[PDB]
Amino acid sequence: MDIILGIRVQDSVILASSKAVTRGISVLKDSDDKTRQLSPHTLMSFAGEAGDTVQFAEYIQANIQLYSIREDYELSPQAVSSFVRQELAKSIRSRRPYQVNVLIGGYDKKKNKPELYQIDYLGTKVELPYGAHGYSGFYTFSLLDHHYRPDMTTEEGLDLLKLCVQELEKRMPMDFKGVIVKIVDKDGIRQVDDF
Amino acid sequence: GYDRHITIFSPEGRLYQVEYAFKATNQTNINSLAVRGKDCTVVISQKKVPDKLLDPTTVSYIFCISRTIGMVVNGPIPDARNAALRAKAEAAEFRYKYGYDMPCDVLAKRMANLSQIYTQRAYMRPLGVILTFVSVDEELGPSIYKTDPAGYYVGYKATATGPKQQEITTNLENHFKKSKIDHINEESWEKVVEFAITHMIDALGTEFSKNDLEVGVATKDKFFTLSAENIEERLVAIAEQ
Amino acid sequence: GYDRALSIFSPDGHIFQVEYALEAVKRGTCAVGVKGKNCVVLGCERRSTLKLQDTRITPSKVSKIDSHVVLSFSGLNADSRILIEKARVEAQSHRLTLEDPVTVEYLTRYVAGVQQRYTQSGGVRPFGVSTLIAGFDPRDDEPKLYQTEPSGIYSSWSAQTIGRNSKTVREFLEKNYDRKEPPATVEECVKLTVRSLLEVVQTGAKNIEITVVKPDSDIVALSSEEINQYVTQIEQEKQE
Amino acid sequence: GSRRYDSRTTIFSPEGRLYQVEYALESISHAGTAIGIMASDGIVLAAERKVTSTLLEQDTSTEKLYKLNDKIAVAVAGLTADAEILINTARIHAQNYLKTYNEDIPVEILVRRLSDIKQGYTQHGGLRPFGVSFIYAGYDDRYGYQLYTSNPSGNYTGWKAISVGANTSAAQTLLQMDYKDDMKVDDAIELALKTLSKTTDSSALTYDRLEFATIRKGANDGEVYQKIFKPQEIKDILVKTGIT
Amino acid sequence: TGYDLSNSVFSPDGRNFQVEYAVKAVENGTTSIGIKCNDGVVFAVEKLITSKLLVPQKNVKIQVVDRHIGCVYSGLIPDGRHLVNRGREEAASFKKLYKTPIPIPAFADRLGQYVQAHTLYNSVRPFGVSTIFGGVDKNGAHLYMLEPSGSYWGYKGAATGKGRQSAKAELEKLVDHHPEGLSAREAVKQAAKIIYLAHEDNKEKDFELEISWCSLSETNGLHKFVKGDLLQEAIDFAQKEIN
Amino acid sequence: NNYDGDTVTFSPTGRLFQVEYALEAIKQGSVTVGLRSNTHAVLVALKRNADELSSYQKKIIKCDEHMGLSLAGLAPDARVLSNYLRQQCNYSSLVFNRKLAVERAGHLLCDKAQKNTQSYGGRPYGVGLLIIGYDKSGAHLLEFQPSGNVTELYGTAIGARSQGAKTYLERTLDTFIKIDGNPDELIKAGVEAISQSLRDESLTVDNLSIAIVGKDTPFTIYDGEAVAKYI
Amino acid sequence: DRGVSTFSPEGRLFQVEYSLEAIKLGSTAIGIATKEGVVLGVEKRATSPLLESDSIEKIVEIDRHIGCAMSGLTADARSMIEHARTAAVTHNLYYDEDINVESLTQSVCDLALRFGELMSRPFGVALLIAGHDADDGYQLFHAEPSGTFYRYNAKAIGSGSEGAQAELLNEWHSSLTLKEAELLVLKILKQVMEEKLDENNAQLSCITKQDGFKIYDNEKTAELIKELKEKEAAE
Amino acid sequence: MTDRYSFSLTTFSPSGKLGQIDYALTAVKQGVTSLGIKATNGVVIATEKKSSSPLAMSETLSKVSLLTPDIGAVYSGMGPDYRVLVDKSRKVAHTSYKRIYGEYPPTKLLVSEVAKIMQEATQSGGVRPFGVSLLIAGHDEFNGFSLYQVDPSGSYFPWKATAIGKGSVAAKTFLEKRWNDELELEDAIHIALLTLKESVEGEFNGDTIELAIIGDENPDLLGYTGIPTDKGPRFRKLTSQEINDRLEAL
Amino acid sequence: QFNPYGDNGGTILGIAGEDFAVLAGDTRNITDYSINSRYEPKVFDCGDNIVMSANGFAADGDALVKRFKNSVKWYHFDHNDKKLSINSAARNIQHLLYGKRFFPYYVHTII
């Protein structure tokens, strides 16, 4: 699919993902949720080739849920991101690789810190205060480089995110039909239903 | 008592199937002998054709493994031919892979290793044969190397195999105690064959006709077997002195 | 590969390896399951031959297969881990392909199938394990309790027990459990489960484990003190 | 054919016991005693080498105590060669986990994996089981200091103090008598050596007949240190605790 | 004891009893023979007529391998067919790689090694047949006989089955009385006589005679069955000698 | 005794007991007869029921338009061997455009049965077969034993009490071989042959099974009221 | 020990004969075929009163036109049912039609002798397979672990089989109605069962051309049990 | 065919004994005596060349074998089993170490690999244990000189000095009295020859005794010059003459 | 480069009546501008009152007809000589064709 954004503020991680699904000529859907909850305090958004995106995301979801039941314990965001990176690094030298890029937003309950990981289809992982995939970063990073502070509130993060989406809606040729925004903090995962 | 049926240890640390394979070795009731000259290696073996319906030219326990290596076998002919075919395949493969003729001692080691495997792996039985390999090696000279069902092998100055091996062995021992050298000091292979036949006659106490013996000779770059008429010429020379 | 037929018929039509697997279950610590009107309780015996045990880290007798289904067992402990792992994997596979968690009956049918397979496959022995599988189907408030055994047969039970001295506690349950009126509350169900184990256990101290499963993935294990209060109240009514 | 010679290593007895597992446990009861004691500030591992010689090179010798990673160690009782097969597998499993999740493997997960491998040899394959019992001493940030044991059946359990090998019945009774929950490592060191000194089949307990190890947070600040004791260091702790 | 319950086990003698028991099945079978002549070989076999309902000349026993080798055997007939099937595969692969038809001594070892391989393991049973076979190659005529142990030698004449002792004695007379050799047509006549004489060990039921031959002059070095007038002539010669 | 535990073991007298025990299963089976002339070949089979509520077990199986067999012994083993014959007949037609010779079909059945008598783990087949067919050399009848032995005959019988039918055919040999161009009379001879093996029971309409193949006659099986004409 | 595929001196496979003994220990199952349909009935035989008897599943649907009842080691039947269901559905996929009852039965029986040293032993369960097709009408088959299957007008398997089969010998005729068959199965089950027959320890089912395979409600069977009691008291 | 023995031939008996391993140790006990002694600047391993026949050339049978340039091995028990273990040990030193790290394995790790092979013949399907005990002597940069014993079970132990086979019990007592931590290599060779004389019946000379050392680097045995860091093998087999010279100072 | 396909021309026509059906085809077989045969039958009686033609690449066409005729034979063996109905034959041919989905029979089939 198209635009996926992430920002890590003081006490939470915010992921924004576009709603459009386009089959070449027509926009088949304008309410698509490009995300999967891996564990109560870990969320993964995704974009790439059709079919492979959902197949990969649900495969990861199933594996993390399996780990959670086996050990009666939630893996740290760092541990989940490492597992995901290895799967993609394995995939890139396969017969037919997963063409999928992901952002992993999680709140570490042990360290009481939000964490945002950016991983591309090659298995390239980086931890960032804010990240994106595709052309999204080309439009938004200059705004984030200017306004971002590590001590921002969740509300200030949402406002900076609105400014990013407005710039995307102005200068991007494609109509991505707005974004679904989700917040990951100490209390878990919730969706902002008005954006 | 299934420790006697397959190749596993008995309470005394023995392998009975290996020991019984040594006993099958003497089933043919044939004795063989090998000696070294200056330039050659000679091997002789008794030949017994008990049935008149047999074609005597096909009855043989001496094998031409390669151009340079010969092999005499003590044991039943099926196991003998099994070992022969394998030795021929191993010798040919060696030359293809490493670019030079397989040495006699190296082939002996290889067949000995194969035999060792049969004493350790349960599904394979030992072959009831003793294999005496002979050649004139390009590095070591005249060579005799002998393998058995235990997977043991060693080089020899001279050797004997069969039901009456001890009589032949002692006879050979006594000769080398006199001469104090590791070989038969003779120029021609013909006289080394004559020495071999003479000392077998002395040790067994029996006379031989041309059809009672089988002879193999190894020289530099070839191993060959003698015909009945070649052996007859050898027997005539022995009788004339 | 090792292909030997270990589970075979005898002249009288018995498969002894399967029957001997049941004898391993008979040796295992007692396990009991009781379903109320709106809950299921799983009780387990802990043999007090082992003290100096670290109870924090020692493998617990009741295992979650998913957030809504649990599994307890009697028999070989090592064998039970293999069945638990397979069941957990199948539970996640079901969610992945059907987009709905397993029903209690489906999960039971799977575990029972694995057990049967190990009774007519070459080179393997049967599991020395019987299981009690309990929980609630997704979006359903009807309690579920099933039993499996080494042969692979399975069935549903209003109340059931397995393991050593299970003949005695089944005797108790058969005269104390009324089908027309099952234990209406959590309290009543836990009380009847602790009572049934007290027929067999010894000291009501760290020898009894109790796990309560309610609808909508509400599963909790009772502590020593909470169980100790049931143990206290039962005997004070008995002194009469 | 071949069926004639098959011992059938993975069958139940009429009583529902696994023959080979039971007999492997009988083997382990003749091995040198190994003890593990867990304290609030660390874990102790103590083990007796089997009737040694004066010509054995002790300072380069290892038969009882093995390192699995920087946080987990094991004490061995049984066939040493069998143990090294499993130990190498466990070392690989720990590294596989570290590569996958970028975190050190939790102690129980490593213990469960090795125990499952032991279980497999009792249910399928027609091979003999491993004649080994392990004591696992380890630390992770979830449960802290942990002691486990596993045996040829593949069953494992957690402990505050435990023994394997010879004279476990006598050893366990002595540990059950003197162990307390608020105990410290230095006290646990003394208990372990005193228990071995009383249960040993040898005439006296000396440095050359022992292997010793501690896992302490006695590592400078929030981290864990493994200490495999040297021969001279075992000699000193024997004098300190008043056994020699 | 117990050494005879499993194949490939050496007894304390150094014997393979299972192979010796396979020989008993061979000795129980009908008589078959082979005669080496001046430029070829002749094969003959006794076929017991168990009932009138057997169709005459239909249940053919002698088998051809390639186009120049004949095979006959006594003992378990299916085992013999299995050995000939393998022989046909061996002969085909030899000719595929080397072009020339397989020489008889080469073919002999291929059967020998295969039969010997069935004495190496307890997962297989030894062959319950002794096989007489041969033909003409570039070096002339060859006759072989192969036992359950894998043992084989070249022969001037060969015999196996229930009437082997009788047959052997008859073959030995021919070797002594003909040091110069026997013609192919003479060998067919003699083969008929020897089977008729060997039928005394199976005198209860009557039998059917079956003969084949490979000869350089008479069959161009190809294996052919003796039929019609030449077969009747041999039957007449045989019937005259027994009376 | 000590040598009947598996098929891979000879007895001290050179016998294979597992094969002999498999032969015994045929003797317990119901009687079936085979006979031929120069134009036609006929199978007659006495079918066996479990009880009065049950059906009568089918005995005859078609393999091709020109070939088929009747069974006696383990029925599932006949299904395996007849399936193999169907495949071999089929391979011959598809690859070589050639109807498989009856004699060659016998050779293939022999070799398939032999492999199960020389290897560990397996077991011999527990069924006997009578194969009839019409090919390029006329009518044929074969008898298959699970030892591997296959025999070409004018007539024969296998199963319980088969000796009575076999003696009758041995007497009638000169008569029934001459029944050319008359299918009904050849079947009559076969029905009269199988009657020499009956005791207590007689041939009824759901008891009798007949099959025929010939010069201008595809292999066809007759059951039910189609055999009332011959009762 | 001895091979799993070994023949006895009488020419029977030891393991097959021994599995037949396990089937004799199983709970009773009865089938009756009529021109109006085929009825299948089983004894549930719960081991304890706390066992919820409606979870005992010894009558099973294979397809809409084929049902099945089991007796013996019932756990062994699950893979046989799975195979039967797959074979029925697969044939419909390949041929756009219902599979013949005989053909389905033959496919199940092909699994039977696939054991050796494939599965390690024969199945320890017998099946009554009942159904309807256009060519041969209403049919009932008895599938054994030997690989053999017989067609029956009526058949009983399990512990009370020889007593039940003698009873079926007398009662069956070619003009039976479906209602008459239902009462007949109930009557004979009641005769051979240890415990007293009711709607909770016994189960009925049938297959008709119109409605297909149906397992009877406990309320429906209870009425047929009451109808049976009254007609037996009527003389 | 196919190997249908996929089950263990070594199993635990009711008493906890592994019979086949015990019986393998019995075979080792019947074997000819071999020994090893460690000095401060070297290690010596020695055995008797028990010739089966005087017509046999016993120089063609090597009981003491080079495994790597700095590691040697000797045995007691079944000769053929030893020969194949030497082949496997030489190969595993390359495949599992030298082809990975570009250097020869340290003594303790090569011993570990040989031990693993011997352990597997004790548990794998359709095989018996090896009927040999090995004594492996070697040197490496970080561990110095070392001596190890490997048994049929796969167990291995490091020694200052030891003996295996026929007269091992008496030989080990002899070594306990003579060994100290200040021995030079020549002293250890002298003690080795003294110890070995007690278990030998017949001839005792350079032709009937096989002896090798792990000592100083031998640049004369390297076969090439020009690389300063390559200084030659530490394993050296003593000649018949070299043994006889030390038998006069005996 | 080797081309596994060819074009043998030909035209076929199937018409369904009220109580009958015809399947017609020309008898000419060709490659490029040459005539291979003036009479090469292309419509076949497959048994059970079914006629079939697989037009296009004649090698694939002959292979498919041959395999369907074989399928009719085995349908009789496996299902007690039941007549293969036209609808059942059609579904069966779908599976024969889709079995080579990724290396297709280059033909247009009509029954």
Side-chain angles (χ1 to χ4, degrees), chain G residues 1-197:
Chain G
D1 189 353
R2 191 179 58 194
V4 185
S5 309
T6 308
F7 276 106
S8 68
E10 294 79 45
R12 301 193 199 89
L13 297 171
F14 284 112
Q15 286 291 119
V16 172
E17 297 300 300
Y18 299 168
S19 74
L20 266 37
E21 296 292 319
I23 292 160
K24 287 177 190 172
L25 296 168
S27 58
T28 310
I30 299 169
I32 297 176
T34 71
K35 291 185 178 118
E36 286 173 23
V38 191
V39 178
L40 254 43
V42 295
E43 167 194 6
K44 285 189 169 183
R45 195 189 283 179
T47 52
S48 160
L50 291 169
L51 155 45
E52 297 176 4
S53 67
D54 48 13
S55 73
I56 297 165
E57 191 188 7
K58 289 171 180 178
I59 301 174
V60 150
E61 188 183 345
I62 290 168
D63 207 355
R64 209 194 100 92
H65 69 289
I66 296 170
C68 163
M70 65 189 71
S71 180
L73 296 170
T74 57
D76 290 11
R78 301 305 157 197
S79 70
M80 299 177 80
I81 298 305
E82 177 59 38
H83 176 91
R85 285 167 169 172
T86 302
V89 167
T90 297
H91 177 102
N92 176 254
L93 182 61
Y94 292 161
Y95 298 105
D96 186 38
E97 65 176 11
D98 288 357
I99 102 275
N100 291 150
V101 184
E102 187 194 289
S103 295
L104 186 278
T105 304
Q106 180 60 276
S107 180
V108 172
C109 287
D110 285 348
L111 302 184
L113 295 185
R114 294 199 211 282
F115 65 94
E117 225 152 338
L118 38 69
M119 59 198 187
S120 72
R121 56 168 183 85
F123 298 113
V125 68
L127 302 179
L128 292 177
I129 297 165
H132 179 271
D133 59 57
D135 305 84
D136 286 53
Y138 294 111
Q139 298 158 256
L140 172 72
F141 289 94
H142 173 221
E144 287 178 295
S146 59
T148 298
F149 61 100
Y150 269 95
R151 191 184 163 176
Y152 278 91
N153 291 130
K155 179 64 172 186
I157 53 170
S159 57
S161 60
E162 90 267 56
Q165 196 69 15
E167 205 64 38
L168 290 164
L169 232 320
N170 286 316
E171 302 278 15
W172 185 90
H173 58 103
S174 60
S175 303
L176 280 171
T177 65
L178 187 68
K179 273 192 150 286
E180 283 169 7
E182 290 164 356
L183 271 34
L184 216 58
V185 172
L186 254 27
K187 185 186 179 291
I188 300 164
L189 276 170
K190 192 177 78 190
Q191 261 171 231
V192 300
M193 274 172 62
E194 287 286 314
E195 26 169 357
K196 184 194 167 186
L197 181 140

Side-chain angles (χ1 to χ4, degrees), chain D residues 20 55 57 82 84 128, chain H residues 8 38 119 123 156 160:
Chain D
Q20 288 290 112
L55 260 38
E57 189 71 282
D82 286 14
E84 289 203 8
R128 69 164 191 87
Chain H
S8 279
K38 187 162 72 179
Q119 190 281 333
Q123 191 167 23
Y156 61 94
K160 292 154 173 168

Side-chain angles (χ1 to χ4, degrees), chain B residues 37-92:
Chain B
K38 292 171 70 69
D39 290 345
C40 66
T41 313
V42 170
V43 58
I44 66 162
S45 181
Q46 285 177 298
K47 182 172 178 173
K48 291 177 187 175
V49 188
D51 195 343
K52 293 199 286 173
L53 294 181
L54 284 165
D55 183 350
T57 58
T58 67
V59 180
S60 181
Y61 291 85
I62 296 184
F63 297 89
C64 296
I65 302 304
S66 66
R67 257 161 268 181
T68 54
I69 302 175
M71 183 188 74
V72 69
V73 184
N74 251 97
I77 195 69
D79 286 11
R81 285 165 176 157
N82 181 110
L85 181 65
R86 186 56 180 270
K88 288 175 187 184
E90 292 288 333

Side-chain angles (χ1 to χ4, degrees), chain E residues 52-53, chain F residues 154 168-178:
Chain E
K52 269 272 170 179
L53 299 160
Chain F
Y154 290 115
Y168 168 95
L169 292 163
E170 210 159 351
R171 291 189 92 267
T172 321
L173 179 56
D174 297 332
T175 312
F176 75 76
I177 192 61
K178 275 169 151 60

